[PDB]
Amino acid sequence: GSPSEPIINFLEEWGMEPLEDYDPAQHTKSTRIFVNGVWTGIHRDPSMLVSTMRDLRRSGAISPEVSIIRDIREREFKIFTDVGRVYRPLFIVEDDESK
């Protein structure tokens, strides 16, 4: 279990826009952002956001047991800091094309 407040702070720092400023007609291509099952905002460049969140988690800025999930098909981006999630470790393959 981890607090979700730093996650929300990081998301709001990197261009996430709240629900009160959201129009579904205007945002026909934005990604819904969920944090612990709560729809908290939207974003229009999910790739940079997920890259930044994953890099921060890999550097220790975010707790390693935080889940970062991007559903491209449903246009959703989910984050979980809940308690009770079963995880396992894996090696990381350098997937950067420019590297």
C-alpha to C-alpha distance for 17 and 44, rounded to whole angstroms: 9
Residues that bind other proteins in the complex, under the rule CB under 8 A: 1-3, 6, 9-10, 12-15, 17, 19-22, 24-26, 28-29, 32, 36-39, 46-47, 52, 55-56, 59-65, 67-73, 75, 78, 80, 82-91, 93, 95
The candidate with the shortest Cα–Cα distance to 17, out of 3, 5, 32, is 32
As measured in angstroms, the least distance from the Cβ of 36 to other proteins is 8
- Angle at alpha carbon of residue 55, lines to 42 and 59, rounded to 5°: 135
- Report the nearest approach of other proteins to the CB of residue 92 (Å): 10
